[PDB]
Amino acid sequence: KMTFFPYELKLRHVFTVATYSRTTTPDVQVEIEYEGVTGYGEASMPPYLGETVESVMNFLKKVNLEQFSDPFQLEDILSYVDSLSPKDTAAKAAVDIALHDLVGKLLGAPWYKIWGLNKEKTPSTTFTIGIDTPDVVRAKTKECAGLFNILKVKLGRDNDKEMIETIRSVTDLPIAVDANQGWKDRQYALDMIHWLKEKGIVMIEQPMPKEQLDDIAWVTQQSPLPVFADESLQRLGDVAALKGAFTGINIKLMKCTGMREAWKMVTLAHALGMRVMVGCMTETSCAISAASQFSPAVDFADLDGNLLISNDRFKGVEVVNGKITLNDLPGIGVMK
Amino acid sequence: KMTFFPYELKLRHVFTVATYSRTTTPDVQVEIEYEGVTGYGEASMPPYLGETVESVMNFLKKVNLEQFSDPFQLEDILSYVDSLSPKDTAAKAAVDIALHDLVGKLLGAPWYKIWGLNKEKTPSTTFTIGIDTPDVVRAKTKECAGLFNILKVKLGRDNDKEMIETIRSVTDLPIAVDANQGWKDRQYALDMIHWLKEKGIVMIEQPMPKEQLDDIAWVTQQSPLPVFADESLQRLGDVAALKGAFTGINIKLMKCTGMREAWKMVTLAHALGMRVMVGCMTETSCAISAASQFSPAVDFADLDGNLLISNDRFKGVEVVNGKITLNDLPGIGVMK
Ligand SMILES: [Mg+2]
Ligand SMILES: [Mg+2]
């Protein structure tokens, strides 16, 4: 039995993505009950990604899980779920996450264990230093520069260099940058990458628009830093085409339809010699913990979504010594 | 605690591969015990594949699993096992199979369930009609045709057409052919595929030598039947290079190091738009059942290895209505 309801996330501070800022995030919480056991799922919908409370609720209303007598047949169930519409990946991810939580609970094990991973190999998660006045930047950098091992900075703006210089003036932590399709000029992108490398940046994400794949490959082939694809891909079927253009791929549950496809993407990327990183949207600990289950296999992780909201409903993965830390709870590892 | 010992397989009848006939098959049985639970593994060594009792025993003697306190860390354990030598894939597969059996038993579930597959989607397994005099061929065909839904014929000989005609004169069952790199001329191979198609053959396996991948792609691109690669690949790292040249790939545990890599190969092939089939060597029900755990994901299956030996040590997957049939036993699904 699947039930679901809207649960708007309240952000602690203004959150900015490219040219979009917000203080809330539409979200739908999902639950799947089977023989007294309940699996928790979630759909998070950053406005610019094209899904809404209406689209997600409408999609979930099309899903009939009652006709399935065995929660363990995830291949069949999720194939059916995917067939209900061409996209709606966040809505589909919510069903996938709840099903994995349910199945893990039925098996009495966390997915990192079912997948055969070593939880001690979880990565450090980045935490973002937001754009603001040089004084506010140095302040916030200092405030969190003590809990994390790596910092994230979103570039592609107008004061990128000043921002990096400001941050680097009060901390020596490595920095991961996400240009989010911000650099349209190929030479600028490469020149900036070399400058960032000199400033201690250790990874760059989506330097240019996804439409300029040839330019991206040109940059990556000469880049001293690993270049990860984000906006350039969404699902499993988008991975292969990026080989040779990117060093690795970024996987997000809300973009790929959940844990099952996410794990297939990790397998595919690796089998193809590409690296993998995992990201997130502003989410409750439900989706964050779910994604964390395969973090022992990634090179980089931006899994701080729940720290950005003031109304988390679950206690799941925690950040210890700046490291994503999985508990021993079965399923996706959360307690309501 | 891992223990192992030689267990030569006794074949029910002379078994031939190309021009090589034999009546026995070197094999090593493996057992991994953990807190009172035992996982069963197996390595099968057809002589022409490069491994021997000596090589397998010597490899296994190098494996130290006692240093690992958690059998669930398959990623780490099998990475370590693979690092011990360049090849020895059958010896490595034995460790992998025993570990999966153990983990499945500890979880209380069979791997087809852990992987999220529907056991009702298991395929029909082929059974081979051996090359012999027309009288023997007709007799042997009539004797087994009633138990199987599809028959296998090993072509690439000097009497291929007569063989197919002889068999087709007593049965209307679909036939899967394995040319075993027997056809050196792409034109001859293509014409043969067209001829076989009219004769009710539904699939072609390794039509030409692996050294002639260019000619193979030429034939496959204009073939009316799916063409599967066998000798053209061994492990996960060999799959991608076959895209566009083959319709699908054939996976065998003794060639790919076991279940974990096999499952990754299924993911990779499918993600790349390729089909998958699974095969086997003459083996006990241990290795046959292990491979059967992912059979619900394959298009074709040649999983009759245990039926060819007279000294099977386990009761596992069975053939019912010509279909591979998985039981509900945990791990790889066998009873000693
Ligand atoms: Mg990004
Ligand atoms: Mg073959």
From Swiss-Prot, chains A, B:
* Top-rank taxon, per record: Bacteria
CDD domains linked to this entry? L-Ala-DL-Glu_epimerase
Known InterPro entries for this protein? DgoD-like, Dipeptide_epimerase, Enolase-like_C_sf, Enolase-like_N, Enolase_C-like, Mandelate_racemase_C, Mandelate_racemase_N_dom, TAT_signal
Positions contributing to substrate binding: R22, Y48, K152, V153, K154, K252, C280, M281, T282, D302, L303, D304
Q: Which UniProt keywords apply?
A: Cell wall biogenesis/degradation, Isomerase, Magnesium, Metal-binding
EC number(s) stated in the UniProt entry for this protein? 5.1.1.20
What the entry lists under PROSITE patterns is as follows:
TAT
Biological process per Gene Ontology, one example term: cell wall organization
**Per UniProt, where does Mg(2+) bind?**
D178, E205, D230
What chemistry does it catalyse, as a reaction equation?
L-alanyl-L-glutamate = L-alanyl-D-glutamate
Question: Which one Pfam family would you cite for this protein?
Answer: MR_MLE_C
Q: Which cofactor does it need?
A: Mg(2+)
Cofactor binding remark: Binds 1 Mg(2+) ion per subunit.
**UniProt-recorded Gene Ontology molecular function terms:** L-Ala-D/L-Glu epimerase activity; magnesium ion binding; racemase and epimerase activity
Q: Which family does it belong to?
A: Belongs to the mandelate racemase/muconate lactonizing enzyme family.
| Classification via PANTHER family | D-GALACTONATE DEHYDRATASE-RELATED, ENOLASE SUPERFAMILY MEMBER DDB_G0284701
Miscellaneous section? Part of a large, functionally divergent protein family. Protein modeling and substrate docking were used to predict the substrate specificity, prior to biochemical analysis.
| Physiological role | Catalyzes the epimerization of L-Ala-D-Glu to L-Ala-L-Glu and may play a role in the metabolism of the murein peptide, of which L-Ala-D-Glu is a component. Is also able to catalyze the epimerization of L-Ala-D-Asp, L-Ala-L-Glu, L-Ala-L-Ser, L-Ala-L-Pro, L-Ala-L-L-Val, L-Ala-L-Thr, L-Ala-L-Leu, L-Ala-L-Ile and L-Gly-L-Glu (in vitro).
Q: What is this protein called?
A: L-Ala-D/L-Glu epimerase
Which organism was this protein described from? Answer: Bacteroides thetaiotaomicron (strain ATCC 29148 / DSM 2079 / JCM 5827 / CCUG 10774 / NCTC 10582 / VPI-5482 / E50)
